[PDB]
């Protein structure tokens, strides 16, 4: 079961320094080289680089050469990419791939760096009832609002897991500073007034969970 | 003495500076040598090792093994490029890359110029010299690479002496290779000159081996 | 650099027909006969999956209507036929010349059921309105295509501030859309109105859907 773990977000004022982490697992860390790509949503992929795990020797391109480099740990089994000094570019999420056949097959958990003087703000849960109905659905909706937290992400279940079909999640959009983001659960009409549902959040930046009940109105 | 033990290679791809095939022998004095096997059989390249028996009869008893650079990379090719001579057939670390003991010569921009090097062995020792000679499989793997289609290479000593051309022809598939690439070895005495002359297909030595027997 | 390109953005194919996508590069990315070309396949929120390599070969686990062709710089991607799970973006890579160089992506979206959205309108919740504020939401649900816009009316008269807009990708499993509106108001701004009513307007109908309540 080859595994490349990456380590969790990142948010970080502009112009200090990030060490990024990459934990080979499931095969031979040696024998195999580490990409890594720059994913920022709609302006596409980028190549970062490469780093031969065994003479350890680096090849970056060209737009990276001067702020980026590649250190390996190989007693341990980890690779890492170091940014620095982080201008406020660069915003988007980084990849650790793998070397095969002069392609990249078992890509990385993903790593999403942020870059803003803001400081961290943990969310206000808000529970979404309907609390008005015709007796014309045999299937509500309910909803559960994040709205003015920082940095991304968030974690949004239901029931701790056990309500995973019809659920949908929403992006967030950015707001002076702050995310704001719905989610939504369908459930039938005869479990709601009758079983409890709960709305599960998790906001790692803070280290704050919240878990917000759904009742009627 | 005790016997050489090569890790995950043959006495080929040892030799030849095959990636993945690094013995930590670090024993400059074996008598003769143990081979660990694999598939790539040395040769991560399909090709032919000629008088490899002889060149194995050679690497033994042996009483010292000093690897030199014999033409350095850096200083040794202006008119045709060292880098870009690596396919994914000889990868390291999943990335194409090449025998770290020969230099895959190609044509510089759009042009082949007619090489020729000499090593005249400033060495007190009989100095093994490995080459290589690309085999392409289509005529325009041939002008694509080399640009020129009468192609030759032309290895000389005071003791071989060998003119060789190239074998243009589709091969079966090995390694997702329809060409060749033979591979050759002579011993140049102390105080000999052998030459380098080619205008293309030449897999041209970096390192080689001084050495002395018994 | 060897800069490929996208042909085309995005392409909208029917289920169980041929989806074609191809890239070219400027240089050639090809070399002792072989061609240094890959095909990755990312939907949102995960990483790219390896599809196809040097660059008809398929990788080990990846479905057999996925196929790659091409030679020097002309290179293609067929999957046939379309399925539901198809719905991601398609990345062209070569490895022929440093540095490596990504294509300009192909998001591919599938064509069914030409459904109307489900809606459902929340008020604001009574925590909320004890911090001052007060956002109302309207979600819209399984719609396609794509294309649709909404319009905020409190007490018949339209806004447009403190809206936002969020859609979703494209479902895996059922092909459709997802969107949510949100409305922020302050807390004295929300109670001197009664009525809140948001309406969309999707191809699947000639008037406004509505959907509101009166406070
Ligand atoms: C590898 O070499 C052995 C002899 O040492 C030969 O019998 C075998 O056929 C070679 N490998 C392949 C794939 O032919």
């Given at each position: 079961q080859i595994q490349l773990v990456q380590s969790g977000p990142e948010l970080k004022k502009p112009g200090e320094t990030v060490r990024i982490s990459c934990k080979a697992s499931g095969y031979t860390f040696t024998k195999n080289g580490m990409n890594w790509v720059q994913q920022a949503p709609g302006k596409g992929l980028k190549w970062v680089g490469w780093i031969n795990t065994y003479t350890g020797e680096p090849s970056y391109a060209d737009d990276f050469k001067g702020r980026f480099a590649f250190s390996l740990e190989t007693s341990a089994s980890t690779a890492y990419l170091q940014i620095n000094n982080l201008k406020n570019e660069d915003m988007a999420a980084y990849f650790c791939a793998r070397m095969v056949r002069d392609a990249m097959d078992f890509w990385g958990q993903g790593t999403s760096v942020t870059v803003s003087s803001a400081k961290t703000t943990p969310p206000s849960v808000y529970p979404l009832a309907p609390g008005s109905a015709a007796q014309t659905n045999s299937m509500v909706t309910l909803g559960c609002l994040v709205k003015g937290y920082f940095p991304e992400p968030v974690t949004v279940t239901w029931n701790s897991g056990?309500?995973?079909?019809?659920?949908?999640?929403?992006?967030?959009?950015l707001q002076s500073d702050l995310y704001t983001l719905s989610s939504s659960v369908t459930v039938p009409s005869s479990p709601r007034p009758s079983e409890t549902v709960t709305c599960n959040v998790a906001h790692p930046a803070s280290s704050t969970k919240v878990d917000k009940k759904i009742v009627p109105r | 003495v005790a016997p050489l033990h090569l890790g995950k290679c043959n006495i080929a791809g040892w030799i030849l500076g095959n990636p993945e095939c690094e013995s930590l022998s670090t024993a400059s004095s074996?008598?003769?040598?143990?081979?660990?096997?694999?598939?790539?059989?040395?040769?991560?390249?399909?090709?032919?090792?000629?008088?490899?028996?002889?060149?194995?009869?050679?690497?033994?008893?042996?009483?010292?093994?000093?690897?030199?650079?014999?033409?350095?990379?850096?200083?040794?090719?202006?008119?045709?490029?060292?880098?870009?001579?690596?396919?994914?057939?000889?990868?390291?670390?999943?990335?194409?890359?090449?025998?770290?003991?020969?230099?895959?010569?190609?044509?510089?921009?759009?042009?082949?110029?007619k090489l020729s090097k000499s090593y005249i062995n400033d060495k007190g020792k009989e100095v093994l010299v490995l080459w290589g000679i690309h085999h392409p499989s289509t005529s325009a793997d041939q002008q694509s690479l080399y640009q020129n289609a009468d192609t030759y290479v032309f290895v000389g000593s005071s003791r071989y002496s060998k003119k060789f051309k190239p074998e243009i022809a589709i091969r079966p598939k090995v390694r997702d290779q329809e060409g060749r690439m033979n591979y050759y070895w002579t011993l140049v005495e102390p105080g000999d000159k052998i030459t380098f002359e080619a205008t293309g297909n030449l897999v041209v030595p970096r390192y080689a081996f001084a050495m002395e027997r018994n | 650099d060897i800069v490929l390109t996208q042909s085309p953005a995005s392409l909208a194919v029917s289920l169980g027909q041929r989806a074609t996508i191809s890239c070219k590069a400027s240089q050639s990315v090809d070399f002792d006969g072989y061609n240094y070309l890959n095909w990755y396949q990312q939907k949102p929120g995960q990483p790219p999956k390896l599809l196809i390599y040097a660059a008809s070969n398929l990788e080990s686990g990846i479905p057999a209507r996925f196929s790659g062709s091409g030679s020097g710089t002309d290179f293609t991607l067929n999957i046939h036929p379309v399925e539901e799970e198809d719905a991601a973006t398609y990345f062209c890579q070569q490895s022929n010349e440093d540095p490596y160089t990504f294509g300009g992506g192909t998001k591919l979206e599938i064509k069914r059921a030409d459904a109307?959205?489900?809606?459902?309108?929340?008020?604001?919740?009574?925590?909320?309105?004890?911090?001052?504020?007060?956002?109302?939401?309207?979600?819209?649900?399984?719609?396609?295509?794509?294309?649709?816009?909404?319009?905020?009316?409190?007490?018949?008269?339209?806004?447009?501030?403190?809206?936002?807009?969020?859609?979703?990708?494209?479902?895996?499993?059922?092909?459709?859309?997802?969107?949510?509106?949100?409305?922020?108001?302050?807390?004295?701004?929300?109670?001197?109105?009664?009525?809140?009513?948001?309406?969309?307007?999707?191809?699947?109908?000639?008037?406004?859907?509505?959907?509101?309540?009166?406070?």
């Open positions: 056990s309500l995973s079909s019809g659920v949908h999640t929403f992006p967030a959009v | 074996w008598s003769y040598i143990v081979e660990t096997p694999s598939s790539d059989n040395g040769t991560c390249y399909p090709g032919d090792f000629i008088d490899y028996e002889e060149l194995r009869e050679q690497l033994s008893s042996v009483s010292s093994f000093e690897r030199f650079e014999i033409f350095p990379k850096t200083s040794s090719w202006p008119n045709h490029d060292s880098n870009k001579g690596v396919t994914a057939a000889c990868p390291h670390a999943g990335a194409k890359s090449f025998y770290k003991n020969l230099i895959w010569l190609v044509k510089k921009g759009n042009s082949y110029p | 109307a959205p489900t809606v459902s309108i929340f008020p604001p919740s009574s925590e909320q309105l004890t911090s001052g504020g007060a956002s109302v939401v309207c979600f819209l649900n399984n719609f396609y295509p794509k294309d649709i816009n909404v319009k905020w009316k409190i007490d018949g008269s339209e806004r447009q501030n403190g809206v936002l807009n969020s859609w979703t990708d494209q479902d895996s499993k059922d092909s459709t859309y997802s969107m949510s509106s949100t409305l922020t108001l302050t807390k004295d701004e929300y109670e001197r109105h009664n009525s809140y009513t948001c309406e969309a307007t999707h191809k699947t109908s000639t008037s406004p859907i509505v959907k509101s309540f009166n406070r």
